[PDB]
Design a protein around this ligand. Structure first.
Ligand SMILES: *[C@@H]1O[C@H](CO)[C@@H](O)[C@H](O)[C@H]1NC(C)=O
Lengths: 1325, 52, 433
């Protein structure tokens, strides 16, 4: 006997004693199986099976009367059952443990009205439920007594009970929502009573009676009762018969009981605890008119949708939260259709909101202060029976149809070549949108809605045309990037290609006949990878080809007896290897020379049946080294326990998950805090989004008390609004503040506030319709919540090897004397030396200026800072200007197209003036470009700085006023005499450009001062600045810079790879060389000699730093997630050993770091174990060495603050494309490597592992090819990637489960059937 | 998302009737994989656990 | 581990902290490092405090620089029974002066010092031996020594200096004893070399110690004559004998992986435990940290919720029982810190899940309350209204002739496990009677 369940025992006999010796031939043996009772008593056998031990058993049984699959038998030995309705509809499913998966019901046509005159309602309704603990009662005489307390005589049959007297439930529910459903049969005056909590429901043969009122019912119907502490709602036969408010207290030790006066027979009984309910009212096309979720105890969520006279969707409201505790006693329709949800509903009259624009009234206007009359998003259609979008308007007055930021589409495009190359109204539908930034975007679509080409152009940037060609079966045979079209046409005229050609820019696929799958996928940057299949169409081999069309490496797959994959390996290419592939495709055997091979053994030989077909045991073997890990999947492949098995010890390192309704409710970490195990409990509400994270504390009496880690607050639209760190002594809130269209504007807390601007303030761009973030402005006030001794700027921060120790003192004193530092050590504004007219020539020296400003920005901690952004043609971020000072209110403007119509000259005079000046200024020289012959004056300390007093004395006067030589020589006395000798010569030789000479004094009065302000402060000159001046049509930036570090990248001829990199003004050529599959193998700008990749995970294996200074060795699981890292030294001794225990998604949970400070004597290490607590948006904190640290995240998910007990113990500031500006923390226990966007930052080499791909913040380009093709180039990065801001795997997940349950309901109801629509667009013509 | 790993699930990537001998070779593959598969002290335990 | 008992704040501010670095020293004397009125250097400003009243006496802008320079050291001393301070100006000139006055002493040498991108650079420091002050220092070329005869007629005389270090780095071995030093060290990553400082200062007699992989940010010496050595790798303890190269033991506590950068190592000093044993204390990344010198090394890190936790510890700290007293400067304030040393205790927990298991027993006893029913008893009446699909009534009209045509099933039961039954009803307009 292997296992038992309830009254039934499972018994099996594995005949493992004898097998065939060599399996050349068959044994032809006989099996005789005997089932007998060894004693006098009877035995009851249900089903018998015989098979080999391997074969996956999915025996299924069918209901003898109703003829549907009502129970299936899994291999492991457990039975999972489906429950069916009276009309053979699948209404419920029961899992192996006995708790149901879902329940569904719908409005029955019997309970209907033939004639009725209403103005608002749902044609039909659906009700769906998912519950925490929920059992169906089969009234078995062997298990009923253990389940129910029976006081009277009753007579039963399989799933039916003709009962008398009363029966009570032994479970004693204590939760928010309780609900029960059943089917009865009422005769004569025989009456039935269902008591739940305080509420008793009395059903009679004529009418169902409740305390408030009695509702008519048929004598045989389905009864559903849903009770919360504030609600009761009774459905009979799918129609909500009653609903009443309740003032009852919280549910504690409540019992479900049935008491019958007379003979009644109840068929099915389904009892649900903590049941999450959803109702949907649908129109004549079975499309949802109004959805009502249950969010929480006495809180519902309502959304309503509108439809046109033809049947297309017009507008949809946002989710709104209506509360039943303060219902105001006007009415109570918590799940019934809300007539007064929208008053502007009838098209005929009452100011319909399509014409007028705002809705007049909600039930609880929780949106009107945010959405200002326009909560809905609506769509206006072209004059067509089909659904073609003309104008779509988002919520908000500004984002509505009447608003400025409305999306408008045109079917006809102004471009002649698009209309003449794609034949109009011949199955090629084109749509064109134009943003106010000067960009248009057109997309052309096939008959089957796959885009054939898209084109977009912007002001001053060349046009983009990318094309995709498809096959007869619809498979994408070819695509062509915009570099191909730019190289070919090289003019305004374009010829969008229509057929498959040979070209090195093209990405080509060649599927087999009848469209099986790819047989040769070829890309320019990688190579031609070819697929080899089997007779049974199993993917057997995968060969890679070099650029010289010769094979490189062959991946082989071996398959099991089941047809699933047995193992996977990679072998190097060879003629014998290719011939062996050719032979083994026929022989079905294995490749002989497998050096590394990962084996997958889902449990089927195990003697414990509950594991069989449920575990996934993995053995990963890379040459000598090995890695074993096995994880337990339950029903529906949800992980319940992850183990890391090693042969040395019988026990397994494991982390255990406790989950219901596909959401993880608790984690059992392999971590010890305060000498006790760390157990995390995640509490969700009735909507299933996370509401609390807590940790279990065990007490000696026999109880567990939960200490909260974080109490999370949400909005009505699923957005997370307030995270409340309530653990420890200091508790504080991080609030997210949103606006009218739905964007995140503020991240506010007492440590560091953030503001984001989307339409108001940008750098040079107007608000783009994409909703991209135009400006981020920070305000750090944590500077008195930390060890303040590390904050103030000293004069040693400016000194290093390159600059002298004595000059740093003078330059810092000069910096302090102008108010650059507000006596606390925090920089007050950015150091622009061309703004400061009087400064030492040592400070005003160029290289010293760069170093001094860079160190003042890095080691300084300004109170306000931020960036103002500017975006390009591919949606990427091409510029970002920082405002480290009070500049936030009044920043400058981009130099180009500056508004000198205000200068005092006419528009025709302005155009010639700007053309001449824009041709005669080299802007990167700054104010030097204002003067002639500045190249000859660079020989001297005085000559390099004289252009600023010369400019100031040109128009403004004052300043030094011919006595500025003495202020210049702060650090010397002798230099003043040389200054006085060279001053008049440099003053007199500086003559203005002929263009500005040709202008006139009433212009030059003031204009050249602000001209100098913009030409001094323009985007080159802050140390916080990212830019990309020149960009390929594929989005490869030919030069990119971060700060003062300028990388000029020249790309290879026909590929998107980098040919050469120039490091900066030095222009020293550092090399970078890729692989045959496109991955970079060496990049000396990161001081990397060689990158070794993993043949199995296709991730990084060995990183070698320059001059063999360090070495990083990585090891993984089969998923490609990192398992362990070993950092070695110059002498091949391990310096740091890091081990990660990964979650299934890729998140880390437990981390063991052992660092040896003395490599020779490793007996005395430093050992640190940390455990990360993840949330919706990111990691909330981490336990490390009996100490918990909070983590404060900004937008996009980067780690801004690390706080210990109300004290900031670490802080990092970032600039776009990921490079870190600065770091505060000095305590090494406080730091975490999650850094930018919560992505592990390899501190030794400087590379993030950005979602299983290396990334270089200095270049802003990925080191590996993009697996899912996102851009025309694989290595391109966007620049900024904000977070979803919606609770993931909570609200979204369960909403998707609600939709798929709606899908199965519609499938069984016949909604997806032949010609089942009242719309001729969906008819069968 | 599946319990059993698909060919596309791996990171290496860039049945009407079956004969007797194919069943025997598949059984040989299955038996081959079956035969192949079969405070500092805590730091020693876990460092032996993760990779050896 | 260290528990802060109390913090006492001084009554006078120190001004703004922008671009200033602290250097606090109590009165140094030949007889011993006795408790006295402390002298702090904040910025270019020297301040006098008396621990009795804890109030500032005077503040004289003596110094030229704010950053404690390696080229402009300063100290207090007592000489001739009179207390003096003495510092280095920007002209390389010693500025000796009694508490109130400023007696400019005569100088036999004026050091010139300059900074290099090659990192090896000139530094001078003020050390004491035999009751006399030595201004010793390495200029750009090599290392030489000087000492003050005093103020008045006194003049710096220079004793003989032989060495020219190939790899040059100068830290003084600092110890808590009556003399400020006993030795002077020249440090390299391959080995340190060390010279005894005597009645004539620097002698020829040198005592090379072997310490590899260590750039030796700090070197300390004990009254028990064992040589401490703070390095980025950690702390390595040496025993000084006729050969000082013998290696005692290593502890990884004061190291780079522990977060101990340049700014934190410079603070650590020594103090007696009380039982003729010495322990070293200094502020670091986690804060003030204190470790007894023993074969089994065990530091104690302050774990408390205050603001004066991270404080630059003044030299000459004291221990009395399990209590220590330290003088510290935090954010331009002076705090005397009383705190306690606690040996960590943690009762172990066992018998987590030993719970006595057993076999699983199953026996099927049918309830006598509940009876199985013989023969069926209820047959629900299915309604044709719910089972009748409406896809037959949606697209009915024929386009070709304008008539209407539709077929619906009259009985259709396929819940049979046997052969299903269907009988279909058709409507099609015709002209036949
Ligand atoms: C001395 O220091 C105090 C702060 O302790 C400061 O306010 C004052 O300006 C300084 N100068 C004098 C001469 O007091």
């Amino acid at each position: 006997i292997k296992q038992s369940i309830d009254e039934w025992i499972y018994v099996e006999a594995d005949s493992r004693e004898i097998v065939v010796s060599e399996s050349t031939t068959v044994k032809r043996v006989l099996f005789k199986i005997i089932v007998k009772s060894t004693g006098a008593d009877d035995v009851h056998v249900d089903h018998v099976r015989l098979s080999p031990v391997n074969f996956n058993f999915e025996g299924s049984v069918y209901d003898a009367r109703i003829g549907q699959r009502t129970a299936t038998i899994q291999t492991n030995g457990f039975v999972s059952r489906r429950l069916y309705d009276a009309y053979n509809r699948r209404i419920a499913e029961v899992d192996e443990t006995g708790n149901i998966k879902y329940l569904a019901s719908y409005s029955k046509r019997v309970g209907n009205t033939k004639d009725e005159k209403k103005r608002e309602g749902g044609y039909s309704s659906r009700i769906q439920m998912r519950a925490k603990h929920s059992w169906v009662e089969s009234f078995s005489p062997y298990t009923m007594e253990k389940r129910w307390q029976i006081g009277g005589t009753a007579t039963v049959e399989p799933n039916q009970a003709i009962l008398q007297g009363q029966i009570i439930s032994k479970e004693k529910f204590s939760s928010e929502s309780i609900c029960i459903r059943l089917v009865y049969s009422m005769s004569g005056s025989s009456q039935l009573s269902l008591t739940i909590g305080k509420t008793t429901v009395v059903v009679k043969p004529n009418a169902v009676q409740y305390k408030g009122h009695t509702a008519t019912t048929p004598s045989n119907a389905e009864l559903v009762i849903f009770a919360t502490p504030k609600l009761t709602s009774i459905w009979v036969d799918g129609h909500l018969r009653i609903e009443a408010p309740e003032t009852h207290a919280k549910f504690n030790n409540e019992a479900v009981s049935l008491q019958t006066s007379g003979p009644v027979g109840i068929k099915d009984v389904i009892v649900m605890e903590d049941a999450e309910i959803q109702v949907s009212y649908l129109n004549r096309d079975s499309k949802p008119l109004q959805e009502i979720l249950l969010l929480d105890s006495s809180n519902v969520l309502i959304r309503q949708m509108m439809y046109d006279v033809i049947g297309r969707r017009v507008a949809e409201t946002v989710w709104v939260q209506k509360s039943l505790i303060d219902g105001r006693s006007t009415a109570f329709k918590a799940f019934q259709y809300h007539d007064d949800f929208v008053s502007n509903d009838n098209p005929t009259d009452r100011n319909y909101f399509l014409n007028t624009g705002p809705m007049q009234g909600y039930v609880a206007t929780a949106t009107n202060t945010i959405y200002e009359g326009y909560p809905y998003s609506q769509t206006v259609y072209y004059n067509n029976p089909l659904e073609i979008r003309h104008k779509v308007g988002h919520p908000g007055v500004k984002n509505s149809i009447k608003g400025a930021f409305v999306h408008q589409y045109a079917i006809a495009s102004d471009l002649a070549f698009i209309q003449r190359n794609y034949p109009k109204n011949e199955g090629y539908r084109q749509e064109e949108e134009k943003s106010p930034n000067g960009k248009k975007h057109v997309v052309v679509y096939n008959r089957r809605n796959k885009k054939v080409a898209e084109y977009t152009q912007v002001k001053d940037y060349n046009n983009i045309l990318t094309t995709y060609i498809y096959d007869q079966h619809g498979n994408q045979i070819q695509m062509l990037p915009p570099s191909y079209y730019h190289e070919k046409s090289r003019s305004g005229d374009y010829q969008p290609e229509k057929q498959v050609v040979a070209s090195p820019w093209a990405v080509t696929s060649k599927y087999d006949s009848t469209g099986e799958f790819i047989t040769s996928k070829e890309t320019p940057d990688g190579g031609r990878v070819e697929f080899i299949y089997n007779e049974y169409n199993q993917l057997r081999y995968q060969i890679h080809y070099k650029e010289d069309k010769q094979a490189d490496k062959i991946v082989y797959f071996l398959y099991n007896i089941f047809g699933r994959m047995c193992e996977a390996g990679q072998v190097p290419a060879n003629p014998t290897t290719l011939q062996q592939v050719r032979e083994t495709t026929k022989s079905h055997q294995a490749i002989p020379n497998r050096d590394q091979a990962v084996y997958f053994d889902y449990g089927e030989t195990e003697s414990e049946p509950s594991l069989r077909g449920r575990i996934q045991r993995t053995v990963k073997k890379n040459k000598e080294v090995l890695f074993s890990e096995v994880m337990f999947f339950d029903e529906e492949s949800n992980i319940i326990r992850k183990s890391y098995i090693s042969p040395t010890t019988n026990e397994t390192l494991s982390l255990v998950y406790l989950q219901e309704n596909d959401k993880v409710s608790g984690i059992q970490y392999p971590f010890g805090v305060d000498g006790k195990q760390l157990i995390l409990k995640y509490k969700h509400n009735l909507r299933g989004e996370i509401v609390e994270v807590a940790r279990v504390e065990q007490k000696t009496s026999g109880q567990t008390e939960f200490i909260p880690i974080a109490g999370i607050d949400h909005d009505a639209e699923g957005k997370v609004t307030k995270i409340s760190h309530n653990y420890g002594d200091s508790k504080f809130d991080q609030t997210y503040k949103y606006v009218a269209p739905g964007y995140l504007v503020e991240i506010a807390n007492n440590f560091l506030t953030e503001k984001l601007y989307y339409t108001e303030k940008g750098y040079g761009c107007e608000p783009t319709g994409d909703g991209s973030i135009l400006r981020t402005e920070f305000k750090a006030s944590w500077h008195d919540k930390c060890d303040q001794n590390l904050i103030p700027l000293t004069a040693r921060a400016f000194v290093s090897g390159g600059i002298d120790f004595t000059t740093a003192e003078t330059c810092f004193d000069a910096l302090l004397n102008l108010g650059y530092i507000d006596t606390t050590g925090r920089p007050v504004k950015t150091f622009y030396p061309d703004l400061e007219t009087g400064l030492p020539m040592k400070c005003a020296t160029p290289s010293n200026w760069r170093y001094i400003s860079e160190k003042m920005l890095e080691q300084g901690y300004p109170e306000h800072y931020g960036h103002a952004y500017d975006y390009g043609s591919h949606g990427e971020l091409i510029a970002a200007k920082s405002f480290v000072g009070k500049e936030k209110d009044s920043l400058t403007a981009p130099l180009s197209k500056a508004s000198f119509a205000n200068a005092g000259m006419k528009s025709h005079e302005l155009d010639r003036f700007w053309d001449s000046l824009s041709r005669s200024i080299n802007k990167v020289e700054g104010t030097k470009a204002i003067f002639e012959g500045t190249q000859q004056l660079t020989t001297g300390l005085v000559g390099s700085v004289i252009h600023k007093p010369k400019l100031e004395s040109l128009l403004e006067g004052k300043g030094g006023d011919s006595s500025i030589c003495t202020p210049w020589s702060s650090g010397d006395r002798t230099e003043e005499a040389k200054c006085k000798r060279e001053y008049q010569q440099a003053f007199d030789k500086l003559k203005l450009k002929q263009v500005i000479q040709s202008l006139q004094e009433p212009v030059r009065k003031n204009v050249l001062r602000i001209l100098k302000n913009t030409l001094a402060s323009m985007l080159g000159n802050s140390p916080g600045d990212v830019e990309s001046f020149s960009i390929d049509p594929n989005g490869n930036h030919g030069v990119f810079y971060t700060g003062f570090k300028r990388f000029e990248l020249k790309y290879k001829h026909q590929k998107n790879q980098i040919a050469t990199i120039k490091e900066g003004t030095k222009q020293q050529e550092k090399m970078i060389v890729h692989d045959d599959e496109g991955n970079v193998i060496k990049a000396l700008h990161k001081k990397i000699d060689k990158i070794e990749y993993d043949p199995l995970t296709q991730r990084v294996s060995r990183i070698e730093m320059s001059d063999r200074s360090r070495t990083l060795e990585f090891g993984y699981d089969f998923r490609g997630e990192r398992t362990f890292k070993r950092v070695r030294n110059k002498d091949n001794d391990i310096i740091s050993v890091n081990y990660y225990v990964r979650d299934n998604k890729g998140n880390v949970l437990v981390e063991y770091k052992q660092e040896y400070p003395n490599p020779k004597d490793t007996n005395k290490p430093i050992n640190t174990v940390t455990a990360y607590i993840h949330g919706p948006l990111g990691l909330l904190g981490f336990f490390r060495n009996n100490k918990y640290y909070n983590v404060l995240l900004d937008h996009e998910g980067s780690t801004r603050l690390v706080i210990h007990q109300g004290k900031v113990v670490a802080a990092y500031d970032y600039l776009p494309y990921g490079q870190m500006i600065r770091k505060y923390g000095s305590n090494p226990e406080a730091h975490i490597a999650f850094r930018y966007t919560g992505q592990e930052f390899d501190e030794e080499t400087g590379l993030y592992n950005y979602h299983a791909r290396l990334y270089d913040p200095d270049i802003g380009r990925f080191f590996q090819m993009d697996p899912m093709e996102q851009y025309a180039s694989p290595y391109k990065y966007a620049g900024n990637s904000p977070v979803s801001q919606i609770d993931p795997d909570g609200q979204i997940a369960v909403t998707l489960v609600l939709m798929i349950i709606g899908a199965i309901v519609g499938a069984y109801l016949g909604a997806a059937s032949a010609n089942n629509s009242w719309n001729p667009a969906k008819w069968a013509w | 998302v599946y319990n059993v790993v698909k060919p596309n699930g791996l990171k290496m990537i860039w049945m009407r009737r079956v004969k007797d001998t194919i069943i025997l070779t598949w059984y040989k593959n299955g038996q081959s994989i079956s035969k192949q598969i079969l405070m500092a002290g805590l730091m020693f335990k876990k460092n032996q656990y993760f990779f050896t | 581990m260290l528990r802060i008992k109390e913090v006492k704040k001084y009554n006078n501010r120190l001004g703004f902290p922008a671009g200033k670095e602290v250097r606090i020293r109590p009165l140094l004397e030949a007889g011993g490092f006795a408790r006295g009125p402390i002298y702090v250097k904040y910025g270019r400003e020297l301040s006098k405090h008396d621990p009795s009243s804890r109030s500032m006496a005077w503040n004289a802008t003596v110094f030229d620089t704010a950053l404690n320079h390696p080229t402009r050291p300063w100290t207090v001393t007592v000489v001739g029974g009179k207390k003096m301070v003495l510092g280095v100006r920007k002209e390389g000139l010693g500025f000796s002066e009694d508490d109130p006055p400023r007696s400019l002493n005569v100088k036999g040498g004026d050091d010139m010092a300059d900074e290099n991108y090659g990192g090896g650079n000139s530094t001078i420091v003020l050390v004491k031996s035999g009751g006399k002050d030595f201004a010793i220092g390495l200029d750009d070329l090599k290392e030489l020594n000087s000492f003050g005869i005093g103020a008045g007629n006194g003049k710096l005389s220079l004793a003989l200096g032989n060495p020219v270090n190939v790899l040059t780095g100068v830290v003084l071995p600092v110890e808590q004893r009556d003399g400020s030093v006993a030795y002077v060290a020249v440090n390299s990553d391959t080995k340190s070399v060390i010279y005894k400082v005597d009645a004539k200062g620097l002698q020829k007699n040198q005592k090379i110690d072997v310490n590899v992989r260590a750039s030796a940010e700090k070197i300390l010496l004990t009254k028990n004559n064992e040589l401490l050595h703070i390095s980025p790798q950690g702390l390595n303890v040496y025993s000084v004998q006729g050969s000082a190269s013998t290696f005692k033991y290593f502890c990884p506590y004061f190291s780079s992986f522990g977060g101990w950068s340049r700014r934190f190592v410079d603070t650590v000093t020594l103090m007696d435990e009380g039982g003729n044993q010495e322990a070293l204390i200094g502020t670091g990344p986690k804060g003030i940290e204190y470790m007894p010198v023993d074969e089994k090394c065990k530091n104690y890190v302050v774990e408390g919720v205050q603001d004066a936790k991270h404080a630059v510890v003044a030299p000459g700290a004291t221990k009395e029982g399990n209590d220590i007293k330290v003088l510290g400067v935090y954010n331009g304030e002076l705090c005397l810190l009383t705190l306690e040393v606690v040996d960590a205790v943690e009762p172990k927990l066992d018998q987590g899940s030993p719970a006595k298991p057993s076999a699983e027993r199953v026996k099927a006893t049918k309830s006598s309350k509940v009876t199985v029913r013989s023969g069926a008893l209820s047959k629900p009446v299915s309604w044709l209204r719910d089972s009748l699909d409406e896809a037959s009534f949606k697209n009915i009209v024929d386009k070709l002739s304008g008539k209407i045509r539709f077929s619906f099933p009259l009985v259709d039961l396929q819940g049979r496990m046997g052969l299903p039954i269907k009988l279909v009803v058709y409507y099609d307009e015709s002209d036949g009677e």
